[PDB]
């Protein structure tokens, strides 16, 4: 089997991407944030505290003839941005882009933090990291991909995120029309539960490539590119007037600037992030100070190849017995 679904930016900055997901019988379609940095599929629901729901589409398990309470199971998750959610668990039929999993754990939110409430466009998350990170207790649950894997034509999924445009998540096949040149594959460590890999270096604009190992995660659920402070300083030093602002919470730059590209290495291959992808616009409406899309990972504890990086590439998440990651230009 295979599946193919379009993923759409939630706003004009590509702050996140939503992908429609069918849950239950008859189908209830929710727009979920596919997140290769976590491993829970959770949704706003009829059980979510009413004051914490503000415009989201909810899953109502009582209206699904295939929903079953997973008795005794609870979940609770905290994300890197400080947001969180928790609740109980149902199993139900879940379909993405024509690919169907029966008996998928659907984690129903009883509580969500303010950031989730305030984002009316995201109805929940669909985790695509390794199932070892799933938070369901006392019986850990499998991700949608893990459940689908054995039925897939090939045990892979691909992320093809657009810049200010829709893109695609495919399951079970590689669309050879969706990228240019060849795909370069690179090793993955699953030791922390992430799609963790080591970039071979970077360049800023037309500058020379610096060969240096940068361990980090491929994370579709993180907006920006978070890299070591040395690398980030080298980038922003090429933008007149750019500076790190503790009050804003990272690097800002004059909105009048033209940003240089940023290149990262994948083995001997190179992925070029155009400068425009690094512009996240005014820090507040009407400001001439703009927020940068490359930020320091110092104090995160891990480097994160978020959407800014991934949307510059066609990315293969290979879930074979020994997982790997592939990157192609597009």
PDB file of N, CA, C and O in Angstrom, residues 245-286:
ATOM      1  N   UNK A 245      19.169  39.351  20.139  1.00  0.00           N
ATOM      2  CA  UNK A 245      18.387  40.137  21.067  1.00  0.00           C
ATOM      3  C   UNK A 245      17.806  39.230  22.146  1.00  0.00           C
ATOM      4  O   UNK A 245      16.958  38.386  21.869  1.00  0.00           O
ATOM      5  N   UNK A 246      18.262  39.405  23.379  1.00  0.00           N
ATOM      6  CA  UNK A 246      17.733  38.614  24.477  1.00  0.00           C
ATOM      7  C   UNK A 246      16.262  38.960  24.729  1.00  0.00           C
ATOM      8  O   UNK A 246      15.476  38.096  25.106  1.00  0.00           O
ATOM      9  N   UNK A 247      15.873  40.205  24.477  1.00  0.00           N
ATOM     10  CA  UNK A 247      14.493  40.608  24.733  1.00  0.00           C
ATOM     11  C   UNK A 247      13.539  39.986  23.716  1.00  0.00           C
ATOM     12  O   UNK A 247      12.418  39.618  24.059  1.00  0.00           O
ATOM     13  N   UNK A 248      13.980  39.843  22.472  1.00  0.00           N
ATOM     14  CA  UNK A 248      13.133  39.235  21.460  1.00  0.00           C
ATOM     15  C   UNK A 248      13.226  37.711  21.539  1.00  0.00           C
ATOM     16  O   UNK A 248      12.237  37.012  21.320  1.00  0.00           O
ATOM     17  N   UNK A 249      14.413  37.202  21.854  1.00  0.00           N
ATOM     18  CA  UNK A 249      14.617  35.770  21.997  1.00  0.00           C
ATOM     19  C   UNK A 249      15.399  35.110  20.877  1.00  0.00           C
ATOM     20  O   UNK A 249      15.258  33.906  20.636  1.00  0.00           O
ATOM     21  N   UNK A 250      16.236  35.885  20.198  1.00  0.00           N
ATOM     22  CA  UNK A 250      17.110  35.348  19.181  1.00  0.00           C
ATOM     23  C   UNK A 250      17.621  36.426  18.265  1.00  0.00           C
ATOM     24  O   UNK A 250      17.504  37.622  18.550  1.00  0.00           O
ATOM     25  N   UNK A 251      18.196  35.987  17.158  1.00  0.00           N
ATOM     26  CA  UNK A 251      18.706  36.883  16.148  1.00  0.00           C
ATOM     27  C   UNK A 251      17.586  37.576  15.397  1.00  0.00           C
ATOM     28  O   UNK A 251      16.626  36.940  14.930  1.00  0.00           O
ATOM     29  N   UNK A 252      17.772  38.885  15.249  1.00  0.00           N
ATOM     30  CA  UNK A 252      16.905  39.739  14.467  1.00  0.00           C
ATOM     31  C   UNK A 252      17.761  40.481  13.462  1.00  0.00           C
ATOM     32  O   UNK A 252      18.981  40.575  13.615  1.00  0.00           O
ATOM     33  N   UNK A 253      17.129  40.989  12.422  1.00  0.00           N
ATOM     34  CA  UNK A 253      17.876  41.665  11.375  1.00  0.00           C
ATOM     35  C   UNK A 253      16.992  42.746  10.777  1.00  0.00           C
ATOM     36  O   UNK A 253      15.777  42.673  10.868  1.00  0.00           O
ATOM     37  N   UNK A 254      17.601  43.748  10.134  1.00  0.00           N
ATOM     38  CA  UNK A 254      16.790  44.798   9.520  1.00  0.00           C
ATOM     39  C   UNK A 254      15.940  44.242   8.392  1.00  0.00           C
ATOM     40  O   UNK A 254      16.451  43.538   7.517  1.00  0.00           O
ATOM     41  N   UNK A 255      14.661  44.595   8.360  1.00  0.00           N
ATOM     42  CA  UNK A 255      13.783  44.043   7.349  1.00  0.00           C
ATOM     43  C   UNK A 255      14.190  44.516   5.956  1.00  0.00           C
ATOM     44  O   UNK A 255      13.765  43.927   4.957  1.00  0.00           O
ATOM     45  N   UNK A 256      15.014  45.563   5.885  1.00  0.00           N
ATOM     46  CA  UNK A 256      15.540  46.035   4.606  1.00  0.00           C
ATOM     47  C   UNK A 256      16.675  45.179   4.033  1.00  0.00           C
ATOM     48  O   UNK A 256      17.114  45.422   2.911  1.00  0.00           O
ATOM     49  N   UNK A 257      17.155  44.189   4.781  1.00  0.00           N
ATOM     50  CA  UNK A 257      18.281  43.370   4.334  1.00  0.00           C
ATOM     51  C   UNK A 257      17.896  42.376   3.257  1.00  0.00           C
ATOM     52  O   UNK A 257      16.752  41.946   3.159  1.00  0.00           O
ATOM     53  N   UNK A 258      18.894  41.991   2.474  1.00  0.00           N
ATOM     54  CA  UNK A 258      18.802  40.843   1.587  1.00  0.00           C
ATOM     55  C   UNK A 258      19.622  39.744   2.243  1.00  0.00           C
ATOM     56  O   UNK A 258      20.824  39.905   2.459  1.00  0.00           O
ATOM     57  N   UNK A 259      18.981  38.637   2.601  1.00  0.00           N
ATOM     58  CA  UNK A 259      19.667  37.583   3.334  1.00  0.00           C
ATOM     59  C   UNK A 259      20.465  36.666   2.414  1.00  0.00           C
ATOM     60  O   UNK A 259      20.006  36.307   1.329  1.00  0.00           O
ATOM     61  N   UNK A 260      21.658  36.248   2.860  1.00  0.00           N
ATOM     62  CA  UNK A 260      22.407  35.240   2.119  1.00  0.00           C
ATOM     63  C   UNK A 260      21.814  33.856   2.302  1.00  0.00           C
ATOM     64  O   UNK A 260      21.096  33.589   3.265  1.00  0.00           O
ATOM     65  N   UNK A 261      22.091  32.986   1.341  1.00  0.00           N
ATOM     66  CA  UNK A 261      21.709  31.596   1.482  1.00  0.00           C
ATOM     67  C   UNK A 261      22.542  30.908   2.577  1.00  0.00           C
ATOM     68  O   UNK A 261      23.530  31.455   3.083  1.00  0.00           O
ATOM     69  N   UNK A 262      22.098  29.709   2.949  1.00  0.00           N
ATOM     70  CA  UNK A 262      22.827  28.877   3.889  1.00  0.00           C
ATOM     71  C   UNK A 262      22.845  27.466   3.322  1.00  0.00           C
ATOM     72  O   UNK A 262      21.795  26.931   2.981  1.00  0.00           O
ATOM     73  N   UNK A 263      24.035  26.875   3.226  1.00  0.00           N
ATOM     74  CA  UNK A 263      24.204  25.528   2.685  1.00  0.00           C
ATOM     75  C   UNK A 263      24.544  24.581   3.815  1.00  0.00           C
ATOM     76  O   UNK A 263      25.385  24.914   4.648  1.00  0.00           O
ATOM     77  N   UNK A 264      23.916  23.405   3.850  1.00  0.00           N
ATOM     78  CA  UNK A 264      24.347  22.350   4.756  1.00  0.00           C
ATOM     79  C   UNK A 264      24.748  21.085   3.996  1.00  0.00           C
ATOM     80  O   UNK A 264      24.227  20.787   2.915  1.00  0.00           O
ATOM     81  N   UNK A 265      25.699  20.351   4.565  1.00  0.00           N
ATOM     82  CA  UNK A 265      26.206  19.156   3.918  1.00  0.00           C
ATOM     83  C   UNK A 265      25.453  17.908   4.316  1.00  0.00           C
ATOM     84  O   UNK A 265      25.104  17.740   5.479  1.00  0.00           O
ATOM     85  N   UNK A 266      25.230  17.032   3.337  1.00  0.00           N
ATOM     86  CA  UNK A 266      24.695  15.698   3.570  1.00  0.00           C
ATOM     87  C   UNK A 266      25.699  14.790   2.870  1.00  0.00           C
ATOM     88  O   UNK A 266      25.726  14.729   1.636  1.00  0.00           O
ATOM     89  N   UNK A 267      26.574  14.136   3.635  1.00  0.00           N
ATOM     90  CA  UNK A 267      27.698  13.458   3.028  1.00  0.00           C
ATOM     91  C   UNK A 267      28.438  14.420   2.118  1.00  0.00           C
ATOM     92  O   UNK A 267      28.751  15.546   2.518  1.00  0.00           O
ATOM     93  N   UNK A 268      28.728  14.001   0.894  1.00  0.00           N
ATOM     94  CA  UNK A 268      29.416  14.872  -0.053  1.00  0.00           C
ATOM     95  C   UNK A 268      28.464  15.814  -0.799  1.00  0.00           C
ATOM     96  O   UNK A 268      28.901  16.650  -1.588  1.00  0.00           O
ATOM     97  N   UNK A 269      27.170  15.671  -0.549  1.00  0.00           N
ATOM     98  CA  UNK A 269      26.157  16.502  -1.197  1.00  0.00           C
ATOM     99  C   UNK A 269      25.885  17.781  -0.388  1.00  0.00           C
ATOM    100  O   UNK A 269      26.290  17.914   0.771  1.00  0.00           O
ATOM    101  N   UNK A 270      25.202  18.724  -1.024  1.00  0.00           N
ATOM    102  CA  UNK A 270      24.952  20.033  -0.439  1.00  0.00           C
ATOM    103  C   UNK A 270      23.501  20.422  -0.693  1.00  0.00           C
ATOM    104  O   UNK A 270      23.002  20.282  -1.815  1.00  0.00           O
ATOM    105  N   UNK A 271      22.827  20.892   0.349  1.00  0.00           N
ATOM    106  CA  UNK A 271      21.472  21.437   0.256  1.00  0.00           C
ATOM    107  C   UNK A 271      21.570  22.926   0.517  1.00  0.00           C
ATOM    108  O   UNK A 271      22.127  23.349   1.533  1.00  0.00           O
ATOM    109  N   UNK A 272      21.038  23.718  -0.414  1.00  0.00           N
ATOM    110  CA  UNK A 272      21.088  25.171  -0.321  1.00  0.00           C
ATOM    111  C   UNK A 272      19.733  25.720   0.104  1.00  0.00           C
ATOM    112  O   UNK A 272      18.728  25.528  -0.569  1.00  0.00           O
ATOM    113  N   UNK A 273      19.728  26.407   1.239  1.00  0.00           N
ATOM    114  CA  UNK A 273      18.550  27.110   1.738  1.00  0.00           C
ATOM    115  C   UNK A 273      18.627  28.541   1.210  1.00  0.00           C
ATOM    116  O   UNK A 273      19.494  29.294   1.629  1.00  0.00           O
ATOM    117  N   UNK A 274      17.710  28.947   0.319  1.00  0.00           N
ATOM    118  CA  UNK A 274      17.759  30.337  -0.155  1.00  0.00           C
ATOM    119  C   UNK A 274      17.570  31.337   0.980  1.00  0.00           C
ATOM    120  O   UNK A 274      16.883  31.064   1.955  1.00  0.00           O
ATOM    121  N   UNK A 275      18.169  32.511   0.833  1.00  0.00           N
ATOM    122  CA  UNK A 275      18.051  33.532   1.856  1.00  0.00           C
ATOM    123  C   UNK A 275      16.618  33.867   2.246  1.00  0.00           C
ATOM    124  O   UNK A 275      16.324  34.090   3.419  1.00  0.00           O
ATOM    125  N   UNK A 276      15.707  33.898   1.277  1.00  0.00           N
ATOM    126  CA  UNK A 276      14.336  34.276   1.593  1.00  0.00           C
ATOM    127  C   UNK A 276      13.694  33.298   2.577  1.00  0.00           C
ATOM    128  O   UNK A 276      12.771  33.669   3.296  1.00  0.00           O
ATOM    129  N   UNK A 277      14.156  32.051   2.610  1.00  0.00           N
ATOM    130  CA  UNK A 277      13.560  31.056   3.504  1.00  0.00           C
ATOM    131  C   UNK A 277      13.873  31.367   4.964  1.00  0.00           C
ATOM    132  O   UNK A 277      13.276  30.799   5.867  1.00  0.00           O
ATOM    133  N   UNK A 278      14.873  32.213   5.177  1.00  0.00           N
ATOM    134  CA  UNK A 278      15.402  32.522   6.501  1.00  0.00           C
ATOM    135  C   UNK A 278      14.725  33.785   7.092  1.00  0.00           C
ATOM    136  O   UNK A 278      14.983  34.177   8.226  1.00  0.00           O
ATOM    137  N   UNK A 279      13.832  34.397   6.325  1.00  0.00           N
ATOM    138  CA  UNK A 279      13.115  35.593   6.768  1.00  0.00           C
ATOM    139  C   UNK A 279      11.780  35.207   7.390  1.00  0.00           C
ATOM    140  O   UNK A 279      10.891  34.697   6.692  1.00  0.00           O
ATOM    141  N   UNK A 280      11.636  35.463   8.695  1.00  0.00           N
ATOM    142  CA  UNK A 280      10.373  35.226   9.392  1.00  0.00           C
ATOM    143  C   UNK A 280       9.609  36.485   9.747  1.00  0.00           C
ATOM    144  O   UNK A 280       8.672  36.460  10.544  1.00  0.00           O
ATOM    145  N   UNK A 281       9.964  37.566   9.072  1.00  0.00           N
ATOM    146  CA  UNK A 281       9.148  38.762   9.085  1.00  0.00           C
ATOM    147  C   UNK A 281       9.266  39.601  10.339  1.00  0.00           C
ATOM    148  O   UNK A 281      10.006  39.276  11.268  1.00  0.00           O
ATOM    149  N   UNK A 282       8.515  40.706  10.379  1.00  0.00           N
ATOM    150  CA  UNK A 282       8.602  41.630  11.519  1.00  0.00           C
ATOM    151  C   UNK A 282       8.365  40.933  12.859  1.00  0.00           C
ATOM    152  O   UNK A 282       7.473  40.083  12.988  1.00  0.00           O
ATOM    153  N   UNK A 283       9.124  41.345  13.874  1.00  0.00           N
ATOM    154  CA  UNK A 283       8.975  40.750  15.200  1.00  0.00           C
ATOM    155  C   UNK A 283       7.591  41.030  15.798  1.00  0.00           C
ATOM    156  O   UNK A 283       7.075  40.228  16.572  1.00  0.00           O
ATOM    157  N   UNK A 284       7.014  42.169  15.425  1.00  0.00           N
ATOM    158  CA  UNK A 284       5.655  42.579  15.808  1.00  0.00           C
ATOM    159  C   UNK A 284       5.129  43.366  14.625  1.00  0.00           C
ATOM    160  O   UNK A 284       5.906  43.907  13.846  1.00  0.00           O
ATOM    161  N   UNK A 285       3.811  43.456  14.487  1.00  0.00           N
ATOM    162  CA  UNK A 285       3.231  44.111  13.332  1.00  0.00           C
ATOM    163  C   UNK A 285       3.771  45.530  13.169  1.00  0.00           C
ATOM    164  O   UNK A 285       3.777  46.319  14.113  1.00  0.00           O
ATOM    165  N   UNK A 286       4.231  45.855  11.972  1.00  0.00           N
ATOM    166  CA  UNK A 286       4.728  47.173  11.652  1.00  0.00           C
ATOM    167  C   UNK A 286       6.187  47.416  11.996  1.00  0.00           C
ATOM    168  O   UNK A 286       6.733  48.447  11.621  1.00  0.00           O
TER     169      UNK A 286
END
